[PDB]
Amino acid sequence: SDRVLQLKLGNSAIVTQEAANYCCAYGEWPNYLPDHEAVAIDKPTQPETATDRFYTLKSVKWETGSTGWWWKLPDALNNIGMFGQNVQHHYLYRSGFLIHVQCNATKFHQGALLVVAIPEHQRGAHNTNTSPGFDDIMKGEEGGTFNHPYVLDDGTSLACATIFPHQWINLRTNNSATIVLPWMNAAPMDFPLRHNQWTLAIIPVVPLGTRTTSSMVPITVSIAPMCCEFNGLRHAIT
Amino acid sequence: SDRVLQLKLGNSAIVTQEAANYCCAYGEWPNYLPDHEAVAIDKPTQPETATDRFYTLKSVKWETGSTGWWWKLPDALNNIGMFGQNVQHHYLYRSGFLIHVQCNATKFHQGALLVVAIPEHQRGAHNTNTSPGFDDIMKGEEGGTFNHPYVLDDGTSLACATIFPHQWINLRTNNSATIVLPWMNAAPMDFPLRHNQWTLAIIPVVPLGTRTTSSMVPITVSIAPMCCEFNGLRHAIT
Amino acid sequence: NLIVPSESSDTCSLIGFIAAKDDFSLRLMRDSPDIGQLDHLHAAEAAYQ
Amino acid sequence: IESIIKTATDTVKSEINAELGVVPSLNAVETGATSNTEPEEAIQTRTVINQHGVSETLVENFLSRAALVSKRSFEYKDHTSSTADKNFFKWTINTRSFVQLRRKLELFTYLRFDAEITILTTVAVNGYVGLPDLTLQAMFVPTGALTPEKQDSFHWQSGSNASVFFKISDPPARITIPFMCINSAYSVFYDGFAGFEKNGLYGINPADTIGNLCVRIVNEHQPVGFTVTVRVYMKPKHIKAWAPRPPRTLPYMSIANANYKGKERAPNALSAIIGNRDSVKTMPHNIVN
Amino acid sequence: IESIIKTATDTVKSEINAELGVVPSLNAVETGATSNTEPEEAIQTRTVINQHGVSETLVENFLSRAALVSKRSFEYKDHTSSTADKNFFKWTINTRSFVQLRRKLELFTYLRFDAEITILTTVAVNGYVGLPDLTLQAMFVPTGALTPEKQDSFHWQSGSNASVFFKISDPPARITIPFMCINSAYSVFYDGFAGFEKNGLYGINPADTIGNLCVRIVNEHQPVGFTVTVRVYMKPKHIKAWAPRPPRTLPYMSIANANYKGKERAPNALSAIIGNRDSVKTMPHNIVN
Amino acid sequence: SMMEINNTESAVGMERLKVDISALTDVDQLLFNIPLDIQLDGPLRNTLVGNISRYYTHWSGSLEMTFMFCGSFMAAGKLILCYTPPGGSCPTTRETAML
Amino acid sequence: INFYKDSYAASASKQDFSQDPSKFTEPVVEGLKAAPVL
Amino acid sequence: INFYKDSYAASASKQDFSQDPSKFTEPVVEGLKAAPVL
């Protein structure tokens, strides 16, 4: 039963026939900001279906030498569709996210991806005292690659990364992963261009392998913002 | 009493201390499309305060030789703020409008402007069989000037234009005009880039005159869309 | 991507289908431009013989 | 507030006024309201019980009169050598060709009506032998249906088009066409463009397209030629009308647009709609005895 | 389940989904069922109260339009020297000769209907003297009744055949013929042979045979020749229809069979029904600005 | 009923009713587009909805397109199918069509 | 007399005497006094 | 208006709004769910 899943948000829908349940991060579901937690007193815009829909990013190729991939939220979506437009015209944003990761192969392929959503993934640099710069962090829709996935590029470890909300794509078992992220911040709202709440990380702990004829094995990320609110309307930074 | 007026919509407000009541066109007030009149079955976006706010256009100079000025709606707003962004990304739009026209002078000035909102102001050309072209009609935010205001550029007459929703700015009496426009179309919604529901016309039936020292006497137009709805989300035409 | 093992065909087909939903309505009947004739059909004259 | 009005209003008798703070003859045109001064307030009046009906200015009565919309003459003859309407014509249906009907309709922005159509046919001998009692076929060809190419083409078999067959000796042929707009009203004026590109027609709402009227003589040609004239009359009925407009003042130029030139001199010149008088103090038809 | 449908269905507003185990956009075409995905399941919808009627696609309205089934011209003259329809013709009744009516009927496998028949007559002088107001006789000759051999043969005395006499100056003659199949419906298609031997006609159900229509001019010939054209129109009414079919795509070849050739190139060629585009990525009428 | 999406030269008869998909070595690639004009000649004309609608002039309401994948059981893949409301050019890139 | 099945075939409807001229003569938000009007 | 004795003479019957499209759209023995359909 729970190997099939359909997700419908706005004008977008995704079906998978090979799910492994799905994760709700820390058991929460996204919600709008209630009046007893609100700070900014202006009336928020809540675009609903214009923003709360799946956006598909550019696919990445799974190759035998891959270290893994990451995308930061909201950064990866800040220039996409009506979510991007609302981000660019408003000082403050808030949302959850629905993350759906897709990777299929044959019954003769093997490989395992850890799919983990990390809150406040503050990156370290390797072998220097200088902190990471703006262009090291803010990759946008393309995302980044792990330098040292074994320490999550932060001097901690991959081994303990299962403390974060996660699933696996084990090619023998499943072809997709789904994680639902609530709003995860110390403030009730934030400036979308200078802080990332969540980092999606996809790490190949078991490498892709087969003895069939090789095909390109892509990994595709689809993300739906959930319960988007925006405050402090002005001209677009853009 | 009814010489003072305050209008508040979204983050914008206008006060006038020298109004002459205000016009509600045909006695209607703007409203959202009810379910028993709706055609398009997708859920509309209703941005509220992001769109339903005053936009101020570029001012025009009142000069002794002026023929008058016109702006077409929604055309004049199709590139402004979040109203423009919603227009560019949606196939269908609907709204009312709040029009506020501003012109002040001294107690030694005289002059009278007819301020008239014309539904379906289909323009004619002078002295040719060829219909007006796209660039004759679609002026955008800058608007146009009347060629022959005496026949409203349509072979009818200025004299009977008071059948349309209107006010006067008579400089002796008042310095502002306000007209509230409902949705005025044969369809419940329309494509915003190819049809204009309303034309604002400002025509100096009595010319500006004084014997004081001359100043620039500008006319300023502020327009608030009201109860905006958009349907058929896609990529921006833009 | 389309991903297949060596013993499957490397090329696969879609069939597309269309239908109306039950919110669908048609109006103002006309002659369909799909059919026409330039002459009498064969044996149409023979119906008079 | 809406009310039912069958007759013009009564006048009540009125007295002398002299009330401080009450000035019913003063008004403010700048508001855009029309003057509310009543006659009883301007002068001393008598009582008049007013029995004049208002039914003849009902919009239904004003517009529901049959008017000429189309007039076509063509030769009924052997056409083998002609270069011409060869015993049939096609007409693209419109309301803009005859100015008397056009100006009345253009008093409104939106109209919803059914159209009563009367088709009148007349025949004359070409330059006499008597007049033939011909049969005609009119066929309505909607948008995207094929129009006939010849008098005898198979399009006239009319499997799904509505056709009416009528004789010249009959009373005029008559049919009603329903209100057929894809909107709830026709757009009498259209401040817009018909297509999604920039080169489409200005001023014609695509939503209002009726179609084509195709009329043939059904008889084979005679040994001699005749001229046949077809006149089409439209009467709007079951009318709703919205947003009254300034009437047309300058002569119409085109069926396709509102373009204007004016007459060369007043009246109805572009510079002067009303004809001139010698001065604002001159009374042109002053009674003198 | 049968239900009464007068208008198109309403749309209900819909929320965000994200339910495990529920996939309304996935379907199985192999079952032969059509997709049951509703719009509310595919996207977020608003509420729409839908008032559009569906009466114009009723099968009664779709088919009950008068269409040309037969058209014959013949010389009205002294025929003593002619070799020809000698002031009369015989027609073997069929629905297959005019493609617009034929294609609509062939959307169904079985039809039951009564036939409203309108007979329109027109006359022209042979290559002018005026047109004569002739009387015509149409006689229905059922299966196994004898057809007339001459304009003046005693078969026209019509003791038990139904005849209608009509003038050219009249309105078109009109009669209704009942549903007369020996089965409960006409077989619009017939995958079978008409006779108990092997040489009988393929494709025509003998059960559907109507008979012959015989039309004469009743007047004796004039001193001069005229050409008379008779047009017969059929309107089905009181219609029941069963088993809808793929529409005809290739041009009809014959009244007697379904034989096909196609047009020489697309559209409606045997190798290509739809006209070509440059590629599956080419948009032929792409808007560009 | 089947759409004639592969209405191209070098597709003959039955070949016009299917679209062939292959493994690609570039990401996000366009596979095909479908012209939606039922009046003009295109993949929708010779369909049950198409043929019946062409006896009429006016139309309203929603359409469904269903696609059946006919690869082998061992074939895997994900497609995105996009409808763009009118006003602009047909999108040629996935991050445009995705909107 | 109307024996046709479609109701749009009927003769003209000359019976609707409802009027509301104030939607054209007095489209002001505050109704005017019969005090000075400004 | 029908003064003819035979009932087949009557005008057309445009009043039967009964439909059952499921006999063509869903002729399956087991009705489908709005779970996966196979």
Ligand SMILES: COCCn1cc(-c2ccnc3c(NCc4ccc(OC(C)C)cc4)cccc23)cn1
């Ligand atoms: C303010 O106006 C803007 C709206 N607007 C309405 C019409 C209009 C609608 C329907 N009909 C029309 C007609 N009717 C010709 C006709 C059609 C079918 C016929 O059918 C027989 C052949 C069976 C016969 C005659 C002639 C002229 C105009 C019309 C045009 N514009």
Ligand SMILES: COCCn1cc(-c2ccnc3c(NCc4ccc(OC(C)C)cc4)cccc23)cn1
């Ligand atoms: C889908 O279709 C397959 C079934 N199908 C029904 C018919 C049909 C039935 C009855 N009639 C017909 C007719 N009627 C000519 C006519 C007959 C008798 C008349 O009687 C007067 C002389 C008194 C007049 C005219 C002309 C053409 C066709 C028919 C043919 N095939």
